[PDB]
Each structure stands twice: as C-alpha cells, then as structure tokens.
Amino acid sequence: KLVIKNFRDRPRLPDNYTQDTWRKLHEAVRAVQSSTSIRYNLEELYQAVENLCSHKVSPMLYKQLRQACEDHVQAQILPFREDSLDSVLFLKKINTCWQDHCRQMIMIRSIFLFLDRTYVLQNSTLPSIWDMGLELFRTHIISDKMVQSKTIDGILLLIERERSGEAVDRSLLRSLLGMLSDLQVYKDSFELKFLEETNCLYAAEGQRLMQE
Amino acid sequence: MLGFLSARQTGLEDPLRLRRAESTRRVLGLELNKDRDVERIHGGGINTLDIEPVEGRYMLSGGSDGVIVLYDLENSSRQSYYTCKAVCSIGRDHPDVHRYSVETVQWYPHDTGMFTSSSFDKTLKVWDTNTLQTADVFNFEETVYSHHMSPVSTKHCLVAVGTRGPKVQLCDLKSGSCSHILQGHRQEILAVSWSPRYDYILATASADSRVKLWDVRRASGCLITLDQHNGKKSQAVESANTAHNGKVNGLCFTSDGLHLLTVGTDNRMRLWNSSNGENTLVNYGKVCNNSKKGLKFTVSCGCSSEFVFVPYGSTIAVYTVYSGEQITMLKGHYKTVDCCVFQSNFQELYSGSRDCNILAWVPSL
Amino acid sequence: MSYNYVVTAQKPTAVNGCVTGHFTSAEDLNLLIAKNTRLEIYVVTAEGLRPVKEVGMYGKIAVMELFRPKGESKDLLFILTAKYNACILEYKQSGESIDIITRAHGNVQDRIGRPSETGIIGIIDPECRMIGLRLYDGLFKVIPLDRDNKELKAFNIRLEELHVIDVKFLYGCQAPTICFVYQDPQGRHVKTYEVSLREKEFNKGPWKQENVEAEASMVIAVPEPFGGAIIIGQESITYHNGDKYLAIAPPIIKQSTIVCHNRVDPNGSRYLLGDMEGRLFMLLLEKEEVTLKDLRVELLGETSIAECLTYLDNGVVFVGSRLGDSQLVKLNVDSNEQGSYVVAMETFTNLGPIVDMCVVDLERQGQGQLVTCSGAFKEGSLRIIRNGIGIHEHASIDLPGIKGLWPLRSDPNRETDDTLVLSFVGQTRVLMLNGEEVEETELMGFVDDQQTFFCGNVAHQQLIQITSASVRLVSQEPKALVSEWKEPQAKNISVASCNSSQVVVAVGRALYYLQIHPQELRQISHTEMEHEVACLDITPLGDSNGLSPLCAIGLWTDISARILKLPSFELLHKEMLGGEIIPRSILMTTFESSHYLLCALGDGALFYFGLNIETGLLSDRKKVTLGTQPTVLRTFRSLSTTNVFACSDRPTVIYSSNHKLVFSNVNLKEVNYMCPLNSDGYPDSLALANNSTLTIGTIDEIQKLHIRTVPLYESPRKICYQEVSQCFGVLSSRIEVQGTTALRPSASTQALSSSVSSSKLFSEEVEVHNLLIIDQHTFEVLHAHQFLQNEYALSLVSCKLGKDPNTYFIVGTAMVYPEEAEPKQGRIVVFQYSDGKLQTVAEKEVKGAVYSMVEFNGKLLASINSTVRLYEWTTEKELRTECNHYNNIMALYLKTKGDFILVGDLMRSVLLLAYKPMEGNFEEIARDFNPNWMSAVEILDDDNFLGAENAFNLFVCQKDSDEERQHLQEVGLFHLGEFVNVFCHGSLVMPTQGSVLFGTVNGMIGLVTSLSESWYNLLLDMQNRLNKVIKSVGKIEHSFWRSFHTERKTEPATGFIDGDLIESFLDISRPKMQEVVANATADDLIKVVEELTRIH
C-alpha cells in the first residue's frame, strides 16, 4: 500500500454548480410534469444528476425533488374538488390523473436514475423515487375523503351495474383497482366496502330467488 | 479429559492418543451393568462365547446342555435399559443339535455367514448363520475340548481341533480331509490357538504341562517347545521343557501376535515370547484356576496398555499384560466363570459362567 | 445410496515434515516441504526460495528423508504415506517437463499390529544400505537397499523392547547401528544394536545400553568426527559414545520440552533445537583432536512454534510450523539488541489448526466470507478467507471526485503508457507516470477546464480529447492542436466513443461519425436517431485494421439496443431490452474469438448477446444481474487475453473460460472507474478509482483465496457472529504460569474493556479462558471477558431465545481440576452485549461439562457430559429445563435442521435425535451402531447426515427407507485424509445442491456438496478413467488412497467423488483428454468439470 502524494493540486471543480444545475432540472421537472417538451436534453440532465451526486448533495437534491412533485400533485386535487361531475365521468377523470402520474413519474425517474439507485437505495429509510410518487398521490389525492368517497362509490356502482347484466369499462376498473393496489389502500378502503356490499346483494338475491 | 479433546483439536497429539487413552480409561472403569442384560436361555452353564470379528454385532454361546444361542448386542430399543434378545438358537428340538456340552463356538473368519462348534459328542459342525443348518460335520474318535480357526488365514481354512487324544487334529473346512495330524504331545490337548500374525503357526496347550508352537506346513514336529526356565535347567526334550507344573488349559496370543499368554492349573500365567518360546518373567501373581477343560480368556485391543481378562474362580481378573499388575477383579457371578470375551468396539466384556448367566460388563460414566 | 462431491478449496498449509538436500540436481540446494498431502519442492537461491514443483501425493506424507545411494548423481527421496505406501521418488527434469519418477514403490503395512504410540519413525542408514521403519510396537521393519528392490520387500526384525521413544542410525559404524530410547518399568534406557541384512536379525550393540533421563525423548546421531549419539530431554542433554559420557542440565531448556532438532554443520559441530514454547536454541559441540570436550546450549531467540526446522545456508533457517506461520529466519552473528540472534526474513501464510469457523456475509454483499480461528497457543489468530480476483494494491492515492480514467502514451516513441488522464466534474487533470514516482503534468492541447468523455492515442501518432463542447485532435509532438470538430449549432456533446481510427459522437438525438485522418477530422456522415441516445460503442472486432463496421447504440425512450452499420448508419438489427430502465454502458468485445455485445442497464442488470460481426444479428440473449448502481463496462487485457471489467458497487470481472463467460467478484468495496494502466513503474496494472481514492494494483490472473490475519497471541477455540451487535464472539484461552501472570501480551490482556466473571456458584501452568468480543470492521477486540479460575469455556453460540428480542452470547463452560478425569461442574452463562458492555444476563449451574450447544427453535439445546437437555428461556429470564436424554456415551457435537437433532457421540458416532413437540420429549429416530470415533458431524438433507471420524475419514448416514428402521445406514465412505474439526453450511461463491465448508487441522478447507445421480454416475466413470490414465507420484492407486480406512475396518470408497481428481482433468493435455473420453465429446466434459469447479 505504497501511498503516493507527489502532486500539485491547483483547481476547484464547481463554480456555482449545484444551485444553477438544480434549476436546470427544476425546469425539466416542471416541464415534464406539465407534458411540455423539454427544452433541455435528458443526457445533459442525467449527467447533471450524476455530477450533483458527486458533491454529496444527494440528500438536499432528494428533498428539493420532493417539493417539485409535492407542489404539482396538490395542484391536481383542486379540479377534482369541484362537484359538477357524475360518478362515471369522474372515474375516468381520476384514472387519467393517475395514468399521467405514472407516465410522468417514470420520466422523472429516468432523469434521476442515478440518485434513485446510488443514494436512495442505500438509504433504506428513504423510499425510491417511484414509491415516492405513490406516497404523494395517495396522501394528497386519493386519501382525500371526498375523492375517496366518490371514487370507491364509483367503482362499486359500476360493479353493481355489471352484476345486473350491464357492460362496463373493464379497462377503467382494472386501472383503478390497479391504482388502489399500488397505493396499497385497496384492501382497507375498497375491499371491505365491496365485500360488504356484495354480501348484501347476493343475500338479497338468494332469498329473493329461492321462492321464485 | 477436556485436555485430550483440545490437544486433538489443535493437532498437538495424534487422534490415536485420545482414542487409546480413552479406551484404557473405559476399561479401567469396567463394572457390571444393570443397565443391560442378556436373556437366559441355557439350561446349564455357558462354556464359550465369541463375538463376531467384523462389526461386533452378533454373539454366539455354547451352553453346557448343547444349545447354541446367537445373541444380538445392538440396542434396537429406545430406552437406556435393554436386553440383548436372542435372535436364533440351535435348540434341543433342532434335528442336528449337539447331544452334549458345546465348549467352543467360533465364527468362520472373514465370513459371518457361517460359524462352527464342537462338543463332547466327538463332532465338529459347520453351522450356517442364515438357515441354521450343518454345512459340514467331522466326527472324531474322541472328545473335543477346544478348536480354533485361523483369524488371519485367507489362504487355508484348516481347523485345529484338540481332542482328548494326544494328537492334534487339523480339519479342513474346504474339501474334507481330517487326515493331517500333528504328533508330539503326550496327553490330552486342552486348548489350541492359531497365531493371529502368521498364517501357519499353531500353539497347542496340553494336560502334560507343555505348550508347543507348530508350523503346520512343517510335517516333522513342532518349531518350539516352551520351557519355564528358558533353558537354565537344560535337559534333552524327552521329559523336560514343561511350560507349567500341572495341566496347561488355556492359550491366548496377544492382539499383536507377538506373545503367547498361557494359564495352567498350577495357578500361574506366563507371557511367553511367541517367536522363540522364552518366558519373559512377567509375574502376574497367583491366578486361581481349577477347571479340567478349556479355560477361555481374551486380551483387550485398541488400548494404551494391553489388558488380559482371565476367568479367576468365580470372578474375572483384569491384569496388565506387559507389567503383571492386577488392575481389579470384576465380581458379579455365582459360580465358576468359564469364558469371557472382549467387545473391542466399545470396551465391553461378556462373561458366561456355570450359573447359566451371561453378565455383560460395561464401563461407568 | 447418497451422492456427494468433495473438493478442496484451500490446499493444506501445515508443514509436518521438511528436509534439505540436493534433490533436483547435484549443485542445487532444495528445501522439500511435506504439507499433509502436498509435496512442495523448492530451491534455495541466494534470496528466498524459488518453487519448482508441487505434486500432490496420494497419501498423508508421514516420513520424508533424502538419501544418496552409491552411484546416484543426486539424492533420491523416500516417502512413507501414513497408509504405509513407501516409494523412492527421484527427480528428473526434461527441459520444461518436470516428472517425479518413482524408482521403486511398495506397501509396507503389516496386517495386524498396534500402531506405535509415538507415531511412524522412518530413518535411513547414513551410508544408505537400509531404511529403518518402526511402524508397530514390538517390530522394527527394515527395508534393504543393497539389492535393487523394485517393490521394497521389507522384512520385520523383532524388537524385544515394546515402547521405543525414538530411534536413529548411528554414524561411522561398519555395521548399521540403531541407537534408540525405550521405556521399561524401571525408567528409560538408551540401547544399541547392529542390524545385519544377511542374518535379518539384530546383534549386540557397539556400546551397551545405558540409563537415560526420566524424560529423555529424542536422539541425535552426531556425524563421523565424534560418533555416538546425543540424547535430549526435559532437563538434560546427555552425550553418549560408550566410553565417553558428557551430560549437562542447562537451566533454560527446563522451561519447555524440546521437540525438533536439526544439524547445522556437516561435521555436526553445532545443532539447532526448537521447543513447544517457540524458542530456538543452538547446541554447540566443542571438539578435541577427535573427541568432544563439552556441550553448550544457547538461546538464539524466538520463532514460530517449530515442528520441524532445517538449516539451508547463511543463517537462513526455515522454521516449518504446524500451528503458526512457516517462518524463514536469519541467524545474525550478533545480537539484535533483544538478545535474539533471529530476525524473521519471510513468512508463509498457514491456516493452522482450524479449531472452528463461521461463514458470514460480511460487507452485506452476496459473497460468503469465512472467518477461521486458526492457530494455537502463541500463534492463535483469525483468518478471514474470501476468494476472488483480489487487487494487489501497489499504490493508493487520495483524490476525491474522480470521474474518468484513461492511459496516454504521451511520448510516441515509448511503448508503455507514461501518462494517466483523470477527469473531474467540469474539468480535467493529466497525471504523468515517470516510474513509481507519479507527478501531474500539463498536456498542451487538452483543455483542462472541461469534463472529458474520452481521450487516448489514435492513428497517425495523435491523441484526442472529447470534452463536453468539442472533439479535439492533438499532434502528439510538439503537443499542439491540429483539428477541432465542433457541433455545427454549438450544443454540448452528450456521448462519445472513439477507437484507433473512428470517432462517433451522439449530440442529443443526432450522431456524427468522424474518421480520424492525419491532422484532419473528416466528418464522414451523420444521422438523426429517433430517441435520445443513451450509450454507444464502436470497439473494433474481427481483424479489421481499427475499422469497426458496426456502432452499437442504446436509446432512452424506447429502451433498446441496436447495431448501426457504418458509415451509412444502416440499422442492421434492433433489440428491445425491455423494462423501464435505460441502457447506460454498451460494449462490443471479443472472447476467445466469440463476439459479444455486453449491454448493461442502469439498474445494474447486464445483458450479453452473441453478436455476428458480419451481419450484426444478436442471438443468445442472456441476462445477468451484477449489482444495483449503473454499470460501466471497460475492457482490459490480462496475460494475452482481453477481459471486461464491470465497474459498479460490486466490481465484477467478465472473462471467458472455455467459451463460457464467467462473472467474478473483485475483492473491493467499490470501483467507480478503471483503466488498464501499463506503466513503467506499474507494468500491467489497473488504475482502479473510487469515490475518495485512486488505487493501482495488478488483478489476479486467476482468482484466489485472500487471507487476512488478525493475531490474538492466544489460542482461540470457538467463534460466533452476532449480526445485531456487529461483533464476533471468540473464546480465547491464554496460558498463565504462576497468583498468576501472563507469559506474553495477548489480545485478552489488550482489550478496550474487560471483566472477571464474579460467580458464587462454586465455593505449573493454567489456562485462563475468555470470551472476546471482536468488532467486525476493525477486528479490534472490543471487550475481553475473563471466566472463573479453573474454568474452561467449551461452547459458544449466538442466538435469541424464547420470545424476547434481545440476542445473547451463550457460553457453556466446564470447571476443570487436575485430580478428576472427566469434568463434573459446569454452567451455561447467557451474556448480552450492549453499548460497549458485556453484561451477565443469566446463569445456570449444571452437573457436567457443556460441550456443544445449538439454538433449537428458540430453545437452547445444551449437551451436558452424556446428556442432551433442551433448556427453555423463561419470561423470568432464567433457563428452565424442558426434557433431557441420557442414552449417550458423551454427546460432543450437535447440529440441527428443523426439529431433528444430530448428536455426534464420542464413539457411537450419530444419533438422529428428534424432538416431538406435541409431547415434549426426545425420541431417538435412529442410530448408527458402528464404533466411529467422531470429530465433527453435520446435516446435509432430510436423510443425509455427514460425519467425519478421527481416523481421517468421511461417511454419510442415510435414514433407511420394523425395528431395523432404527439403524442409520452408512451409504457414503471416503478417506478424506485430514482431521475435520468443524463443518458449517455456506459457500464462497454467490448443479450441486447444498454446500458445506469444513476446516481441518492441516488448514485444508474442503467443500462437500450433493449431486444428482446422473452426474454421479458420469463423474464416477470419469474418475475411473482418469485413474487409468493419470500416473500418480508414488504409483499409489487412487482407489486405495480413498479407501475408507480404520485400524479395524477397510472398505472401498463409495458415494463420494474426489473433487481434486476430477479437477485435474482441466490440467491434462488434449491427447490424454481424448484418451479419457475414448467413449460424449471432450468439450462437453470440459464444460461439465468447469461447472463443478465453479462451486469452490
């Protein structure tokens, strides 16, 4: 282990690199969320994330990413807080508001792949940028009582239609029940009500059909 | 004993050291076991025992009433206490049972499938362990005190048979020919024994106080005629070279085969050199015997100092072979002991007596 | 019938015999070393040693001595395998080929006989007429040599003395004279005889017997000028010649018995002596004209615990040690200021007697990492074995923030790389390699103030630099620019991959393929790829003169690997990798003329496709996960072949063994980047870089075991890893002499904190046991807890019992007193480690020694002397009995799988004790009724209980299928050739179901695994064929060498495959491979044996 030191160490690597570089991604994160085409280019953004991970600013960079997604998901609840919509149309509204969060939050992962796997993966306390997305969506949108109410009452009301012989949007149901399962609120919120309601209907149908 | 375990663990002492030291410790602590029993099946006394050479599992026994039990010493049960159940038996109801006392039962060496026996009915029968049927029977003109098969010979399968005539008989378990005889003794031949080391060296003890080693290949007498005083009282061999003062009725080569222990009715043991018949003057004190037939005794194997277990009256005596010290005196029987056989695998001793018992001695702790 | 595979991961490293003499040729000076089975020949050059051969004898080499008959130009060699195979080896070199030809071989085993107490003693007449062996007590086997014995027809000469301590041939007697020390009830008596071949019997000795010391335990036949024999002992060194008698009782040698001797001078004027304590004396004989005047013993100094030492020349004495490291010391003519004339020159690592070991996944990888408690009294130490392609780190540098490495031939004339180009975030630094000295220079033409994506030598004696702004071409002399291709619209370059004559840069979506021409970068073509380019490579392949007709690319949005023909950028092939993770580094490379396109995703997953260079058709899509962080595939050359180094958090090398890629861990915490740095000061090195440092060191040509060493200076006994506390629990056992004082500073005396066990239960030299707590990063003993006076800690297990969450160190001790033979009083202490403190949580006095313990479904399962009682951890926190079991001789070893318990009795050899939970009592499912003295026992499967007895054997008990079902059946039998101390499930690598490492007393670390019956039959046929083909060293039939051997039993090996014999199939030339595969093709079987070699 013959250590060597026979060097001259003149330079300084970053000028004002972390503050300016984050503002580059911050626009890119903002542009990605609003589906606007990215003025800057991913490789510059990815390599920018790479360099910021060298300066050990991964924790602060992780937090400042959260404020970006935190402050966009909340911007999406307010249209759903307007009750000028019926149940069926609403489900497509929230479902699209979930599919977009998946498409977007995949993109924000691709740019931030280095941060996601170097820093966050080792920090077992923190969740990945993906599960980060579900947590934001769950608490700030789906955990809304009015949205949760008019949502689960949505899915339930279609199944009751489906049970009575109607044709319903199976794809829409699959996404929502996929949406709830990913957010993990499927079991607590929807499974109990669905089993509860299902018990009633077939119990009513059973006694009804017996004498008929 | 943890010291031995650590020494073996760190490679200091060879594993041989712990093995032999522990075997010696177990044999020194030998005691009768009420945590083990052997089923009573013989009407009369037990004259002989021979644990099988390989695997040390089965165990024959020649009762004085002609019944050849075949025990099984493996604790097939689950409890700490068990009894060695008798697997088979050549009962009196058997068509070919021995009419009188069976005094030697020996396993056919290198083949547990067969075993041999011989009785005062002047017969030596080759028994098949599986079907219990006489493969070959040799009828002699006179009784058969003791017989022995070479435990080392892979070449021949002769069987020295010491009848109460003066002539040692050699019976061949291959194509039958008891013609070969070894002349030179003067009275009955109470105990014979092949050499565990050399194929063709047979040591025969008689009742005229002579122990002779025969090279059965040689057909012109015996190699050696053992003499008490190593030739000090030199006299030509016509009435001299007597290995005892009375009948000599027991032989047992040491395990290595380098020394021929002899016990006789003059109440002494003597550790004779097996290559030139020179008494090595090991004292052994006074050993009591008065039997008038083959006295069986065996010598330990796989122990630091070789022990010898000689029936001593109604007790088993444990002497150290090469020093003559008396280790102890196992004491559990009600009549004279006729045969003790050492279970080399676990340092256990089975000693049939004249009181129909077969007491299994085992170490303590 | 069970089926198993036994292979030797670590070859034995204990030296049980070493001789010196002219074995290779007349003028040589060899130093043969008889490791347990290995025979490592050496040559004593002026410095160190020059190993010349290493042949594995099919035997435990018990006797080794060099003798030179009359007419032989160079010394022959006589070897006596512990199974009593005797062979007269002769060295014979034919150019490159080295063959240990066997002059004469034979077996010298007597069918019946007590193996001698002191062990095999084999000696040779100094005039070389006979070889005297004393195998069995009472007999003295003599081998003639005057006749030409091609079978070594020995003849037994009877001995009238039954306990011979040591025997040596005397010097200068007209008749071959032995001079031995034997013990008879009156004491010990030296004696002599005149062996005589014509008579085949001894005769009267040249000088009659004499009385010797009560512990005279050795003989030294002094050479011709003096004659006679010296006789060492506990307290005296008596010299005898029949009429002369010079006896002294030096005070220094009283301390510890002398065990090994050697002759320094050919006239025997001076003698070396080493003792158990480790001292190194020097016996000096003073001569008169000749006769002998007086004897003197001088303490040269200290060395390892010398089992067998030899004098080579110039004070270079090789202290071969079974317990410690086989040192190699220099005898200074004058003192070293410490009164020690001995200064350790070299050292050979020796995994000494492995008392016990534990496999731990230290560093949280997927890699097993053994931790053995090798060594003994003074040489006790921890060895940390971890196999791999380790980094012999030559030079480490502190340089945080490195982001790329490249080598540069900054001087066109020079062949080797004299300059290394780092690259940091937003800048670049050039490093100049001028010898081992390394200084930073300035390469004019390279912009320092930009990050670099590539820079290296290219065609036409020119460099190149591809910053984030502009590809730059620099004239290598006088180092000034000649061309600067820039993006036409002034955008940053995102990717770049250059080679000797081609540069392709992907700016965002658009490519630009430049062809380097002399002082001219000519943009041949370009294109606009659909989605943003992720990574790409143009590495040359085939035999094109640095003109790669392919340019593999990976793209961002539609995650996919492609191959674009050059210069037209025609899409020959596309391949959807799949997943949501983009490719990050894509590499085109050749492996034994088999092309591959290794593409590594950004999640750590790696793909390799079989590339067709002409048509670019990816086939054989395979995936391998090598890590988690994004990978960086950099090529490098090692020993005339090109490998691939996958820099990640788990640095992995990729190389192709027999047309099959092998992914091997590199023993390093992290490697961000790399570059093959072939410098003058570091030829054929790798400049491995990480977050904080820059390292250099040649990579292992072949991977190997790497053995750290943590000296304790006190013999360890047991080890356990307590993960939650992050520390090992080691039961050291140091020696004290007197009160009591320590003979040397041991780890137990050098711990950060300590404590003496104040226990009220119970109310020369001794052992003062301890329970060390070793930090599992620094390997610094955190806490050393001393046990009671006269207490032996035999067992140690780390577990959490009952329902409480705490994890406890549990030690089962046993009080020892000299008067008794087996211990009576013991206790089971339950320690807890917390906050750098070791508290006693419980205590449970028992009625015997606690030999072995194993946590059993949260219930402690002790083993008091002859009983196996299953304690229970009560909520009150005191162990409470549940059920006992008394049907044992002495239960020493316990191993568990589920609820079954395997008890290794001292001599009944197994007991498949099963715990019936519905009833709360043990039930003996089965037993094996053979008298196999055990050493360690382990469980493989539901019905495969491996066991290792003390006669150097292995056996496999198989639960059969009435009462005969209670008999465990021995199905496997195999004469391992070592004393197995410990088993432990695991492996050292991330086909063979199961894997059971096991230590030995010689240092061997084998590895037992199960096999399918099909491969068992195949490999058994292979083994028989190889035996028929390969010629062994001593012509020892392999079936005999592995025959399960014990003094009372001998059976052929079955249900076991000798792993080393199969692995030898790799190292046999092709024609003999074809012979071995005379009746399936050779390459298939090479592949099979490779799949087997992968396990260890």
Closest CA to C392 of C27, C718, C696: C696
What's chain A's Rg over C-alpha atoms? Answer: 24
Contact yes or no for C163/C184 (Cβ under 8 A): yes
Burial class of residue B271 in the structure, from the number of CB atoms within 10 Å of its CB (0-12 exposed, 13-18 middle, 19+ buried): buried
Q: What type of residue is C443? A: L
Locate CATH 2.130.10.10 in chain C. Answer: 2-14+351-387+705-1010, 15-350, 388-704
Q: What type of residue is C655? A: Y
Closest CA to C238 of C271, C211, C257: C211
Measure CB to CB from residue C821 to each of B6, B11, B25 and give the nearest one: B25
Beta-carbon contacts of C1083 under 8 Å, excluding residues fewer than 6 positions away, are C658
Cα nearest neighbour of B25 on chain C: C821
Residue C484 pairs in a beta bridge with: C472
Tokens matching residue B11: 């490679």
Cα→Cα distances C107→B197, B198, C86, C88, C155, Å: 17, 18, 6, 12, 12
CA separation for the pair B180, B168 (Å, rounded): 9
Closest CA to C313 of C561, C91, C551, C30: C30
Contact yes or no for A127/A109 (Cβ under 8 A): no
What topology is assigned to C388-704 in CATH? Methylamine Dehydrogenase; Chain H (2.130.10)
> What's the CATH number of domain C1011-1096, 1.10.150.910, 3.10.580.10, 3.20.20.70, 3.40.50.10190?
1.10.150.910
Superfamily designation of domain C2-14+351-387+705-1010: YVTN repeat-like/Quinoprotein amine dehydrogenase (2.130.10.10)
Q: Note the Cα A37 to chain centre separation in Å.
A: 20
Assign A32 to helix, strand or coil.
helix
Contact yes or no for C979/C1049 (Cβ under 8 A): no
Beta-carbon contacts of C865 under 8 Å, excluding residues fewer than 6 positions away, are B365, C822, C823, C848, C849, C851, C890
Contact yes or no for C943/C920 (Cβ under 8 A): no
Q: Which residue has the tokens 């149309």?
A: A89
Closest CA to C280 of C238, C340, C239: C340
Mutate to test the interface with C, among A5, A8, A41 (most CBs of C within 10 A): A41
Contact yes or no for C552/C562 (Cβ under 8 A): yes
With an 8 Å CB cutoff and a minimum of 3 pairs, decide whether chains B and C touch: yes
Q: Is C137 an 8 Å CB contact of chain B?
A: yes
CA separation for the pair A126, A108 (Å, rounded): 17
The resolution, in Å, is 4.4
Beta-carbon contacts of C529 under 8 Å, excluding residues fewer than 6 positions away, are C506, C509, C510, C511, C553, C555
- Chain A residue numbers touching C629 (CB-CB < 8 A): 117-118
Assign C789 to helix, strand or coil.
coil
DSSP states along B35-65: S-EE----SS-EEEEEE-TTTT-EEEEEETT
Cα nearest neighbour of B258 on chain C: C138
Cα nearest neighbour of A7 on chain C: C439
Q: What type of residue is C199? A: E
CA separation for the pair C641, C656 (Å, rounded): 9
Could you say which residues from 919 to 948 on chain C have a Cβ atom under 8 Å away from some Cβ of chain B? 923-924, 929-931, 933, 935
How many Å from the N-terminal Cα to the C-terminal Cα in chain A? 91
> What's the CATH number of domain C15-350, 3.10.20.580, 3.40.50.300, 3.40.190.10, 2.130.10.10?
2.130.10.10
Instruction: Give all strands of the β-sheet with C279-288 in edge-to-edge order.
Output: C258-263, C270-275, C279-288, C291-302
With an 8 Å CB cutoff and a minimum of 3 pairs, decide whether chains C and A touch: yes
Measure CB to CB from residue C425 to each of A6, A51, A110 and give the nearest one: A51
Cα→Cα distances B131→A152, B73, B127, C863, Å: 83, 20, 9, 44
Q: Is C580 an 8 Å CB contact of chain A?
A: yes
Going along C762-910, which residue ranges are E strands?
A: 766-775, 781-786, 791-799, 808-815, 826-834, 837-842, 845-846, 854-856, 859-861, 870-873, 879-883, 891-897, 900-905
Burial class of residue C545 in the structure, from the number of CB atoms within 10 Å of its CB (0-12 exposed, 13-18 middle, 19+ buried): exposed
- Residue C362 is given by DSSP the state G
CA separation for the pair A107, A120 (Å, rounded): 17
Residues constituting chain A:
212
Contact yes or no for C933/C951 (Cβ under 8 A): yes
Contact yes or no for B76/C963 (Cβ under 8 A): yes
Q: Which chains touch A (3 or more CB pairs under 8 A)?
A: C
Could you say which residues from 322 to 381 on chain C have a Cβ atom under 8 Å away from some Cβ of chain B? 322-323, 353, 355, 376
Q: Note the Cα C775 to chain centre separation in Å.
A: 23
CB atoms within 10 A of CB C17: 20
Cα→Cα distances B135→B96, B116, B117, B127, B131, Å: 11, 9, 12, 6, 10
Please state whether beta strands B68-72 and B58-63 pair in parallel, antiparallel, or not at all (unpaired): antiparallel
Contact yes or no for C973/C1057 (Cβ under 8 A): no
CB contact under 8 A, B345 and C924: no
- Chain C residue numbers touching A47 (CB-CB < 8 A): 494
Locate CATH 1.10.150.910 in chain C. Answer: 1011-1096
CB contact under 8 A, C395 and A11: no
Q: Note the Cα A39 to chain centre separation in Å.
A: 24
Closest CA to C376 of C321, C421, C299: C321
Smallest CA–CA separation between C439 and chain A, in Å? 5
Beta-carbon contacts of A67 under 8 Å, excluding residues fewer than 6 positions away, are none
- Chain A residue numbers touching C394 (CB-CB < 8 A): 2
DSSP states along C920-974: TEEEE--B--S---EEEEEEEETTEEEEEETTTEEEEEEE---GGGGBEEEEEEE
Contact yes or no for A58/C629 (Cβ under 8 A): no
Closest CA to B38 of B59, B56, B63: B59
Measure CB to CB from residue A13 to each of C427, C440, C534 and give the nearest one: C427
Provide the number of CB pairs (under 8 Å) joining chain A to chain C.
83
Percent helix, strand, coil in chain B (nearest 5)? Answer: 5, 40, 55
Measure CB to CB from residue A54 to each of C397, C425, C532 and give the nearest one: C425
Smallest CA–CA separation between C349 and chain A, in Å? 19
CB contact under 8 A, C323 and B11: yes
Q: Which residue has the tokens 């009452």?
A: A153
CA separation for the pair B173, B148 (Å, rounded): 12
Q: Is C245 left (phi over 0), alpha (psi -120 to 50) or beta?
A: beta
Longest dimension (CA), chain B: 64
CA separation for the pair C687, A204 (Å, rounded): 77
CA separation for the pair C156, C623 (Å, rounded): 67
CA separation for the pair C978, C12 (Å, rounded): 9
Cα→Cα distances C295→C33, C236, C239, C300, C465, Å: 30, 11, 8, 16, 78
CA separation for the pair A62, B167 (Å, rounded): 107
Tokens matching residue C357: 């070991």
Q: Is C115 an 8 Å CB contact of chain B?
A: yes
CB atoms within 10 A of CB B331: 12
Mutate to test the interface with C, among B1, B301, B307 (most CBs of C within 10 A): B1
Assign B316 to helix, strand or coil.
strand
Q: Is C951 an 8 Å CB contact of chain B?
A: yes
Smallest CA–CA separation between A100 and chain C, in Å? 16
CB contact under 8 A, A11 and C630: no
Domain with B344 in it: 1-365
Measure CB to CB from residue C395 to each of A4, A8, A47 and give the nearest one: A4
Closest CA to C849 of C876, C806, C878, C820: C820
Provide the number of CB pairs (under 8 Å) joining chain B to chain C.
106
Tokens matching residue B268: 């002494």
Q: Do you find a cis peptide bond into C567, omega within 30 degrees of 0?
A: yes
Q: Note the Cα C569 to chain centre separation in Å.
A: 53
Tokens matching residue C771: 């329970």
CA separation for the pair A160, A152 (Å, rounded): 12
Tokens matching residue C603: 């999640």
CB contact under 8 A, B1 and C821: yes
Contact yes or no for C805/C787 (Cβ under 8 A): no
Helices A42-54 and A17-33, interaxial angle, to 10°?
140
Rounded to the nearest 10°, the torsion over CA A40, A45, A51, A52 is 100
Contact yes or no for B314/B296 (Cβ under 8 A): no
Q: Is C602 an 8 Å CB contact of chain A?
A: yes
Smallest CA–CA separation between C760 and chain B, in Å? 23
Measure CB to CB from residue A11 to each of C427, C532, C691 and give the nearest one: C427
Could you say which residues from 972 to 1001 on chain C have a Cβ atom under 8 Å away from some Cβ of chain B? 979, 981, 1001
Burial class of residue B78 in the structure, from the number of CB atoms within 10 Å of its CB (0-12 exposed, 13-18 middle, 19+ buried): middle
Contact yes or no for C716/C730 (Cβ under 8 A): yes
CA separation for the pair B254, B268 (Å, rounded): 17
Helix (H) or strand (E) holding C190: strand C187-194
Cα nearest neighbour of C162 on chain B: B322
Contact yes or no for C50/C65 (Cβ under 8 A): no
Smallest CA–CA separation between C822 and chain B, in Å? 5
Tokens matching residue C967: 């008999």
What's chain C's Rg over C-alpha atoms? Answer: 34
Cα→Cα distances C205→C157, C198, C221, C240, C777, Å: 15, 17, 15, 13, 64
Mutate to test the interface with B, among C718, C734, C887, C953 (most CBs of B within 10 A): C887
Beta-carbon contacts of C819 under 8 Å, excluding residues fewer than 6 positions away, are none
Smallest CA–CA separation between A176 and chain C, in Å? 21
Contact yes or no for B307/B326 (Cβ under 8 A): no
Count of domains in chain B?
1
Tokens matching residue A172: 């829409």
Half-sphere exposure of B100 (CA within 13 A, CB side): 11
Q: Report phi then psi at C204, rounded to 5.
A: -65, 140
- Chain A residue numbers touching C425 (CB-CB < 8 A): 13-14, 17, 51, 54-55
Could you say which residues from 882 to 911 on chain C have a Cβ atom under 8 Å away from some Cβ of chain A? none
Closest CA to A78 of A146, A32, A153: A146
Assign A20 to helix, strand or coil.
helix
Q: Which residue has the tokens 């480790």?
A: C278
Contact yes or no for C592/C578 (Cβ under 8 A): no
CA separation for the pair B273, B253 (Å, rounded): 10
Residue C606 pairs in a beta bridge with: C600, C624
- Chain B residue numbers touching C115 (CB-CB < 8 A): 16
Cα nearest neighbour of A53 on chain C: C401
Contact yes or no for C856/C902 (Cβ under 8 A): no
Closest CA to A82 of A144, A10, A9: A144
